[PDB]
Design a protein around this ligand. Structure first.
Ligand SMILES: [Ca+2]
Ligand SMILES: [Ca+2]
Ligand SMILES: [Zn+2]
Ligand SMILES: [Zn+2]
Lengths: 5, 163
């Protein structure tokens, strides 16, 4: 892969 | 060109800590340490932010290698498919960067995914970069001797200001 949390 | 995350999350202090929590069998430990620093400094030279390394406990940016499920909502998946992933700035999981141990990683002298490139992409996410529409950008969504593109620099400086 960029993830939010 | 570049994108950020919604509501522009960013680190709020002038210093951000980081820890390499787990290593890969593919490289010496010192080699991973030196490449992570180099990746961080590519972004750091452009902006008013400094990185401090820690060796124990919790740091802002937790970096490591893992096989399979490893405590977040995005478990790794064996050889192939997903390679790595990272999170936007914030408490807890925010900022962290994870690499799948079930690939092959290289410092440039062997077969593998180029770890310096990969770490620069993932740590761009850890500082608040999203994906770019510009193919020349380190932050382009697909993996494809290097530098940050002009789009990468414009985006990071939009979020932090200029050094
Ligand atoms: Ca964190
Ligand atoms: Ca995988
Ligand atoms: Zn990405
Ligand atoms: Zn993860």
């Amino acid at each position: 892969x960029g993830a939010v949390x | 060109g570049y994108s950020l995350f919604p509501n522009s999350p960013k680190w709020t202090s002038k210093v951000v800590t980081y820890r390499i929590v787990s290593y890969t069998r593919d490289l010496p430990h010192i080699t991973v340490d030196r490449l992570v620093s180099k990746a961080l400094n590519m972004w750091g030279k452009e902006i008013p932010l400094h990185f401090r390394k820690v060796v124990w406990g919790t740091a802002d940016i937790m970096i490591g290698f893992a096989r399979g499920a490893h405590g977040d909502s995005y478990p790794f998946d064996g050889p192939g498919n997903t390679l790595a992933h990272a999170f936007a700035p914030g408490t807890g999981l925010g900022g962290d960067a994870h690499f799948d141990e079930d690939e092959r990683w290289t410092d440039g002298s062997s077969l593998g995914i180029n770890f310096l490139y990969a770490a620069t992409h993932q740590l761009g996410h850890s500082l608040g970069m999203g994906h770019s529409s510009d193919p020349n950008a380190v932050m382009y969504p697909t993996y494809g001797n290097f530098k940050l593109s002009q789009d990468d620099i414009k985006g990071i400086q939009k979020l932090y200001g200029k050094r």
